[PDB]
């Protein structure tokens, strides 16, 4: 499906996980920020490409990036 | 009067006043100095 | 069970669970009695698919339309009737 990437600029605010409508992102332990956590995308095959996770990231430029592509059945959001 | 003067100093009110004054000036100038294509000098 | 209670999910009956029903699919086998002629006369189409039926259709459409367009008379088709009045002639004397 689409490709979702997380960068070291993340601050572990979890706001991208809460905005995801298909449960693609999750928070994992990390040691590069004060929050001691970082976002991750273990199940991007369920990603639809809404980039709501991108709109919720507060860093200057996005620590979470969605690149789109493939456009499989789950990606197109088809119920038929 | 502080609040009234502040409101009158807002962008739209001041724009209305300034542009109305400019339009009146131009209209009166054209009343007394109309239909000129060349600046006489 | 699908209908024992208000449950509508059952792995043992997935067709019922997913709604894969046939609403009007009557399976009564006794419809016609005399149908030997229809089986006999239809051999070019049945069990042919891409080989015979498609080629026959292409040939019998191409030849049919070619014959119709080549053998049509003037009255039926106006393009083959041809002009009948004098040329109308164009402006500036150009013809």
């Amino acid at each position: 499906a689409h490709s979702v990437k997380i960068y070291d600029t993340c601050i572990g605010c979890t706001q991208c996980v809460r905005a995801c409508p298909t449960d693609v992102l999750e928070m994992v332990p990390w040691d590069g920020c004060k929050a001691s956590q970082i976002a991750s995308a273990p199940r991007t095959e369920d990603c639809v490409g809404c980039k709501r996770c991108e709109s919720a990231c507060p860093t200057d430029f996005l620590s979470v990036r969605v690149y789109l592509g493939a456009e499989t059945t789950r990606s197109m959001g088809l119920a038929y | 009067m502080q609040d009234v003067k502040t409101y009158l100093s807002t962008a739209p009110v001041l724009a209305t006043l300034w542009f109305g004054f400019l339009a009146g000036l131009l209209i009166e100038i054209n009343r007394f100095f109309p239909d000129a294509l060349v600046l006489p000098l | 069970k699908y209908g024992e209670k208000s449950v509508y999910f059952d792995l043992g009956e997935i067709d019922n669970t997913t709604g894969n029903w046939d609403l009007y699919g009557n399976d009564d086998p006794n419809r016609y009695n005399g149908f030997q002629n229809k089986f006999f006369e239809t051999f070019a189409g049945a069990f042919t698919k891409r080989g015979l039926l498609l080629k026959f259709l292409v040939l019998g459409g191409a030849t049919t339309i070619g014959y119709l367009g080549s053998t049509s008379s003037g009255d039926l088709l106006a393009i083959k009737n041809g002009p009948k009045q004098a040329p109308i002639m164009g402006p500036r004397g150009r013809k």
Binding site: - | - | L54, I65, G69, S70, S72, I79, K80
Partner: protein, 34 residues
């Protein structure tokens, strides 16, 4: 025109038959699963 029947032949083909064959072949091709 040397052959007046030749337009009446060719125009129907390239107009109806050639599109029919072309679109049938392309529909069969783009619907293959392989």
């Amino acid at each position: 025109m040397t052959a007046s029947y030749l337009p009446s032949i060719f125009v129907p083909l390239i107009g109806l038959v050639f599109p029919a064959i072309t679109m049938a072949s392309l529909f069969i091709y783009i619907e293959q699963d392989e």
